[PDB]
Amino acid sequence: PILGRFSSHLKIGIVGLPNVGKSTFFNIVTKLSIPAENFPFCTIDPNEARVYVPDERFDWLCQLYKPKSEVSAYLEINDIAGLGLGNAFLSHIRAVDGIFHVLRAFEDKEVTHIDDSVDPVRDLETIGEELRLKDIEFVQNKIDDLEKSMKRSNDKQLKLEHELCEKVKAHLEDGKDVRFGDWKSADIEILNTFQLLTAKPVVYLVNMSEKDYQRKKNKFLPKIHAWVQEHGGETIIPFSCAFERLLADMPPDEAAKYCAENQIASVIPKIIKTGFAAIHLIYFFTAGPDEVKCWQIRRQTKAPQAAGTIHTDFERGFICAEVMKFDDLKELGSESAVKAAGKYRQEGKTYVVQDGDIIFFKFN
């Protein structure tokens, strides 16, 4: 029972102040994004992107079956707005399910009188407090709506929600983000009706010089690390926009030579995989001579709901899911070797699909 909304169609937003590399980062992303014509029913705006999730298990499967269709899962990313105050900012961030938080950890080479006041911890404290204040406001309006409803109705559901809202208001007002509260399952169920800003999981991307990234050291990182440790312990990923930009503009062979020469590598794939996982998406594979494909689902999704994302009938007349975990295929070498070990399963409607499961659905 998790904080988040009940959907496979979840998104991560990019958040940061101006001149931190947020726009350079999104531009790198936008190069790696799927042409919108692949999604005729969907609207990809200029500030949005869908980028393939890299996966070595998928590649292994492709290498084995040599399918006529190779399809990857995607991460939907939205570059957010203007800078937790503006109406437009709120509407765009309330629409995503997680936050790529871009922090600046480099100074300018330009020796000028203009003070670029580089302080990522201060920037963290600012945004945090701003997102909390707007949540304190959201819950306060729900309390007023609720005690309006309690003049009319004597229903206890109202009071349970009112008293919860009170605890959240105290939690938030004590400078604490909703996602690090200790909430019993029913309270999580209620909170999920709100989709409060501070309930959204975050991944910190600390942008720094190619020099710092390469040597794996940065003067701001230790104070950022220590602060995150007191404020949620969520993933911190150091990176250099400038290097990643430089790198994306090359062809693969040049990029490979540059990486060898300079003793350095891209972290973009990891950033993508990490954002995908942080917003609670996973996927199963289908796999055979026709196709190998990553079907994204919210984690905790059961086999019938999963089958439906391929075809409605697979769900409507669900019989079972034939599933062998990817690790068993890899470890033994083939579908038969899996079957002989008794590791090819017939799974029922209660089964919770696991990341990497390779599923062949049966129906009607």
Side-chain angles (χ1 to χ4, degrees), residues 1-62 64-67 69-108 112-113 115 117-126 128 130-133 135-141 143-147 149-151 153-155 157-158 160-162 164-183 185-222 224-229 231-256 258-260 262-289 291-304 306-315 317-324 326-348 350-364:
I2 210 161
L3 256 37
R5 63 187 179 88
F6 188 100
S7 184
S8 291
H9 307 296
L10 301 168
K11 311 168 193 20
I12 194 159
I14 313 169
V15 170
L17 284 316
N19 301 306
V20 309
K22 181 164 75 66
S23 292
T24 318
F25 168 68
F26 186 71
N27 298 344
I28 292 159
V29 157
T30 309
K31 258 171 179 268
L32 281 45
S33 59
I34 307 173
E37 29 274 326
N38 282 223
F39 302 90
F41 282 108
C42 292
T43 301
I44 301 182
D45 321 86
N47 79 291
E48 302 184 347
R50 289 183 181 191
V51 292
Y52 294 128
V53 180
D55 201 300
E56 284 186 303
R57 303 171 294 163
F58 180 65
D59 302 343
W60 190 92
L61 282 175
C62 294
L64 184 63
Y65 286 98
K66 306 180 174 73
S69 172
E70 294 182 354
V71 187
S72 291
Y74 64 86
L75 174 59
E76 191 173 331
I77 307 180
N78 302 356
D79 186 34
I80 290 163
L83 265 168
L85 278 151
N87 281 18
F89 182 93
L90 273 332
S91 35
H92 284 294
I93 193 167
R94 285 177 191 244
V96 307
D97 304 287
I99 285 162
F100 274 134
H101 200 320
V102 185
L103 303 169
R104 169 168 174 187
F106 63 91
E107 286 122 59
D108 290 82
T112 115
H113 288 275
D115 191 293
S117 292
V118 178
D119 188 351
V121 169
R122 184 251 278 112
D123 295 344
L124 278 159
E125 297 267 6
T126 316
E130 214 63 63
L131 298 175
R132 276 193 304 278
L133 282 171
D135 273 343
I136 292 160
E137 179 183 29
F138 183 92
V139 174
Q140 185 52 78
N141 276 110
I143 290 162
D144 308 346
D145 280 23
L146 278 162
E147 64 207 358
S149 276
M150 286 167 60
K151 297 172 59 54
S153 158
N154 209 14
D155 180 13
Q157 231 341 98
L158 295 176
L160 277 180
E161 290 174 33
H162 176 265
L164 170 55
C165 286
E166 230 67 42
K167 289 212 153 223
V168 182
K169 181 159 143 281
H171 187 253
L172 284 171
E173 230 146 18
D174 184 35
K176 290 166 173 158
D177 289 341
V178 172
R179 103 206 70 116
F180 314 121
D182 191 21
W183 315 103
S185 297
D187 285 3
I188 290 161
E189 193 187 45
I190 291 164
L191 286 168
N192 285 338
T193 65
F194 310 162
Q195 297 292 296
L196 300 186
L197 272 21
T198 52
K200 299 190 200 298
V202 4
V203 170
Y204 307 105
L205 303 175
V206 195
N207 187 26
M208 51 178 72
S209 68
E210 174 175 337
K211 183 206 162 72
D212 283 0
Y213 175 69
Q214 195 288 318
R215 74 197 228 246
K216 292 178 171 52
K217 213 158 277 147
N218 171 273
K219 82 187 200 186
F220 296 108
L221 186 64
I224 300 168
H225 181 86
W227 182 100
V228 171
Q229 251 45 238
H231 298 84
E234 294 156 303
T235 302
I236 298 169
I237 299 147
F239 79 122
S240 171
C241 276
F243 160 65
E244 299 285 5
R245 173 183 164 283
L246 181 159
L247 204 65
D249 274 345
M250 299 174 176
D253 40 284
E254 185 180 356
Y258 188 87
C259 283
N262 293 104
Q263 288 171 37
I264 196 170
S266 186
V267 73
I268 290 299
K270 183 194 182 156
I271 282 176
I272 293 163
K273 296 165 78 52
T274 306
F276 191 88
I279 68 175
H280 306 294
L281 294 170
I282 56 163
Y283 35 86
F284 58 96
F285 310 114
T286 46
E291 192 180 58
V292 173
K293 179 160 165 171
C294 310
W295 298 85
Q296 60 221 64
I297 35 174
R298 187 191 102 265
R299 189 188 302 262
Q300 287 175 163
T301 303
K302 303 148 178 300
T309 75
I310 307 196
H311 200 279
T312 181
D313 289 346
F314 287 13
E315 183 169 14
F318 179 90
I319 284 167
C320 83
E322 303 186 346
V323 20
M324 36 153 65
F326 162 85
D327 293 348
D328 292 334
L329 225 211
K330 173 75 181 287
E331 189 192 36
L332 278 35
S334 78
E335 174 167 342
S336 315
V338 173
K339 285 173 170 178
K343 300 229 144 196
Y344 195 77
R345 305 113 61 178
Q346 230 100 300
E347 292 293 353
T350 60
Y351 183 62
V352 169
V353 184
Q354 293 178 58
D355 191 75
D357 289 349
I358 298 174
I359 302 176
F360 186 85
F361 287 101
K362 311 298 261 93
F363 76 104
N364 221 226

